[model samples]
Target: VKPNYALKFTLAGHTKAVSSVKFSPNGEWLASSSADKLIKIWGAYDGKFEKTISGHKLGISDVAWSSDSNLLVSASDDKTLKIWDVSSGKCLKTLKGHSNYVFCCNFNPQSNLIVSGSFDESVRIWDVKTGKCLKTLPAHSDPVSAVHFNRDGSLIVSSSYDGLCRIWDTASGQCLKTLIDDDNPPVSFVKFSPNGKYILAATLDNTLKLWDYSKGKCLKTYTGHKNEKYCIFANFSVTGGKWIVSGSEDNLVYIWNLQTKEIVQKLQGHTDVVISTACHPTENIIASAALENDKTIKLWKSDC
Candidate 1:
């Protein structure tokens, strides 16, 4: 049965399309990046805007909160990632290396590491505490669209416009597994399962494919949308490994059963393409960002 849900609150501040949304590790704050070239932080529970970080010359592509929730990292089309002090609302340092737009980024769950994917077809690992770039992996033939660390924090998974996903050994910068989406479309996002045993991928073919990490095989595919859906985003639940949440350009947010390879529910409310979706670190709450509407961010609760 579908779970009963409600809209807790609406966050309004971005003057343009919201591209990315993320929850803090402690689930107390939410950070959003937008085409207006700004990153806005909010009180996660009340939907109250805390501050607006402005410095990016172009659209902000992604925002990540440090494990301590004291620092905010933002990637932009300006080809840099800026680290900001959350408490003081000050831009601490601007990391410059990517030759093209930075598409996505996330902090490692284990160490003081940050991984960023870029339009330059590379993923770089950074020493977050020192502001030094540790290593660069050139695994994608096209622009790297997304980068995510597995639950164990030992491996990094990245998706690219070349229609492939690559698994990297975070320590050695070696390409451990190369995943090709043979379904005739490019992949937009690749995220590891909650236990790091499986990989979940979203493709432009409008389907989500599950892969067995140990065998490097596509085990199953979940189909729901009928048309091409661009800019897919997905994340796993922190408490339970049973479900997966994904957003698509089809204007739908989907909840899937990880074990059964079945779609549990199709969340409908967005009036435009849903570009990103993020689950609260410890709650059954989710926030989605759309591409074409002024009402960009929407929060939803899952009773299940």
Candidate 2:
């Protein structure tokens, strides 16, 4: 059985491609970042444009909300990440040091630390309060695509175009494990399972694999997406982790049953490639962002 998800609203504001969209952990705000060099915040319930944040000198790549939902961190092509005070709409701290474009970032569970991956092939852990880089791990040979912290903030997992995903100890800055497929396709996005026991990775080879990170085993593979050209993101659903959701180059959003590995839903509306997708933290709602030709964000909600 599949959840009945219907498109609720289509938001058009960003002039360029919407690179990423995320719902605040508290489910109050939905934030989107774009190649237009702006970040827009929207009311999660009605999909109303609340405000636009402008500070990055170049395109913004990704935006993540703090666990408390009071702060936001954004990674940009300007080679820096900025922490924003969500309520005041001010840049609280600008973390600089990556030699190239920063690609992905996320706040740890405690909301006091940040892990960011970059085109510089390094993943840096930053102190949220002091705006200082705590450690830089030479994470990959090619550009790093995504970085995420486990539920407890004890582990950081990073994926790269170098065809590998590596796990690092947050406190020691040591490489703990390296995960790779037999074919070794370039990895685009990686996320830790909600239980903190597994990792889900999106690969350019047109598949998303759920891995038992502790033992370096691929437990399941979800397919049926056009993803060879772009770095699409896939994530576990927030509603009890029963399903996996992802944006596809085929101009659709896909949801798969976690246990069955079967695609349960294929959402169609976007005219161009859909590159990013986010599930509302506490509801059966999803936000999807498309490529340059589409340049819009669409929100979907389950009828159930």
Candidate 3:
């Protein structure tokens, strides 16, 4: 059975489009990044304001939490990524190597490395402590839209506007596999499954596909949402990995059954495009962020 998600809180602090929202690994805090050049922290359960992090000279595109939830890394239009100390709201490190806007970034499971994608069509690996660029992979022919590390941090996955997804060996900086759909639609987002055997990729063709990366095959596809314009994101459910959820350009959140590939729910409320949604690490709660016109972040709760 699917859990019914109802809006519990609408948060308004960002002055521009909210690009990404994520739950800390520990599930204690929620971080939201905006085109307004700021990242805000809030209580995950009550949606209470906690702190604001600001340092990027341009709009911030994404924010990811370290495994311990005490640190955050943000990608920005300034062509730099900043690691922040969550408690003191201090900028810990600034990694600058990409020649263009940084679009997406994530902390590896070990919390010692960061991988970032850029419009310069490259993906860079960084040492979290030394603030040094470790390896630069000329990953795509077009702008890279998303990048993520697998659960064990041994592999990295990236999606690009060039309409392809590539997996890399984290240690050797070698391209292990490249995945491309027949239609060659631009890919907006991609992530490794919890078990690290598969990848979930969202394409501009209005489809979310599950791919068995090992065999280079598409396992399943979930459709019914508009996503041709922006870099919209989606992910597997945290509880059982039995459901898939994604934000839609049609101004709703779409949830589908992982096994049957059936959309089980369409959540409403925002008037503009919903660009991002994040599931709580160990709860039924979710956070959704809309574009500039909506300029709001919402928290949804489900009684499982």
Cα TM-score per model: 0.94, 0.98, 0.99
Give a tens-digit lDDT track for model 2, residues 79-171: 999999988889999999999999999999998999999999999999999999999999999999999999899999999999999999999
Stretches of model 1 off by over 4 angstroms after superposition: 181-184, 226-229, 238-241
The model with the greater TM-score, 1 or 2, is 2
Misplaced by over 4 Å in model 3 are none
Global Cα RMSD, each model:
1.9, 1.0, 0.8
Comparing 1 and 2 by lDDT, which wins? 2
Q: Which whole-number lDDT from 0 to 100 does residue 187 have in model 3?
A: 95
lDDT of 2 at 185: 89
Residue 190 deviation, candidate 3, in Å? Answer: 0.3
Candidate order, TM-score descending: 3, 2, 1
Residue-wise C-alpha lDDT for candidate 1, range 133-209, written one tens digit per residue = 88988868888878989876789999987888889999899999887644546788888887799888888777888
**Candidate 3 structure quality by residue, lDDT tens digits, 59-115:** 999999999999999999999999999999999999999999999999999989999
